[PDB]
Amino acid sequence: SVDSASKEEIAALIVNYFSSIVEKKEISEDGADSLNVAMDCISEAFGFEREAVSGILGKSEFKGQHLADILNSA
Amino acid sequence: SVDSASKEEIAALIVNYFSSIVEKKEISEDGADSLNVAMDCISEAFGFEREAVSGILGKSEFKGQHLADILNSA
Numbered sequence A, B: 001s002v003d004s005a006s007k008e009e010i011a012a013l014i015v016n017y018f019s020s021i022v023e024k025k026e027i028s029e030d031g032a033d034s035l036n037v038a039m040d041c042i043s044e045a046f047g048f049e050r051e052a053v054s055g056i057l058g059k060s061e062f063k064g065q066h067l068a069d070i071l072n073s074a
Helices: A007-023 A029-046 A053-057 B007-023 B029-046 B053-057
Strands: none
Touching: A007 A029, A007 A053, A007 B007, A029 B029, B007 B029, B007 B053
């Protein structure tokens, strides 16, 4: 009986994070490309859009994460 | 002045999560493939191994995440 949220909610947080990393350009452009295709494959897997993260993230407040420890929640 | 941890620490948590998803087979094998190549591209970007997550995760206790909200920390 785990409670690590749903892979959907997590994936949204995940791709939004990399979208933020490439946004702020905290990573080399070569690595950024690898992140872009990564997020694409992630979104491909669960069948969602990377800009739909808002709807999904707003669906999950979490019980530990939420805010502050991750600023890419919203 | 953000404090959302380092993209390294996060990436490790990220790939380990998908590794757990495909482990428990919570996702279709087609989606699993997309996750596998995703994790590969993620690991490619930051230049790390997906099994090295332990070393990286043990490097980050986090201030909100840590445990319970995510069981794929350890």
